[PDB]
């Protein structure tokens, strides 16, 4: 099952804060693994059942998927202090990672690492799960050449237009969403519309003003992205075929 007694779990470093509390690093001494490296999501205030429910959908939620791009469930210890055991990403939010990592990743990766994004939410797609959340501060790296979405659950600055105005969240906000995490990313994790207020943001995307085309971006990636970016979400593809261009951009990228 899926509880896991404390006596197995040896805290560590903290590596980092969520939405909940602080994010460790630590052991889990199992049989059939007598040390393995994982990641521990504590609950600050989950003396309130009302937050316990919420930071548990989390792991409730995990639990469902299988992809090699989704980070995977371990366990969860549910008296107090609540905590959620999953796997360890040894190289922390994407967002961070692009920031220091900027100069020293090639454009092959950056692509490799959309590409595989797309896979993880192509799978989400053919379950028809909607995550509503898709970032770069959303995603952790597991190495070099492997990123996995670490999230599921206002970010206006990322939001589909129906999102903002009728509260919608449907498979085509997500591909929405997902134009800005990819312009994220050919960005080194700068934050769309810096020093935008939220509410000038609807207007202009009204407007049809749109994310400009990165440096160093390919005008194949860049179409990509506006095709995301349809105002109307009928018009917008799925993770599918994204899936497919991505996997030829990354093909002929690697040949330079
Ligand atoms: O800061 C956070 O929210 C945060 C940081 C790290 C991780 C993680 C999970 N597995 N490996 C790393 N999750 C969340």
Known sequence: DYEIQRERI?????????????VHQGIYMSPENPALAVAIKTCKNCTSDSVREKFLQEALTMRQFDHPHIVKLIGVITENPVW??????TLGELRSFLQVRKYSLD??????????????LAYLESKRFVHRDIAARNVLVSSNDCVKLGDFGLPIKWMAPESINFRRFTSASDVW???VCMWEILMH??????????????????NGERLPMPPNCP????????????????????????????????????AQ
Do not use: H
């Open 189 to 206: 994790g700068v934050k769309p519309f810096q020093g935008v207020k939220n509410n000038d943001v609807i207007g202009r995307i009204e």
């Open 84 to 89: 959620i055991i999953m796997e360890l990403c």
């Open 177 to 179: 969403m997902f134009g």
């Open 219 to 254: 005008p194949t990636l860049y179409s990509l992205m506006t095709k995301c970016w349809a105002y109307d979400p009928s018009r917008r593809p799925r993770f599918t075929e994204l899936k497919a261009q991505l996997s030829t951009i990354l093909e002929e990228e690697k």
């Open 10 to 22: 040896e805290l560590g470093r903290c590596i980092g804060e969520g939405q909940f509390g602080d």
């Open 107 to 120: 454009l092959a990766s950056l692509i490799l690492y959309a590409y595989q994004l797309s896979t993880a």
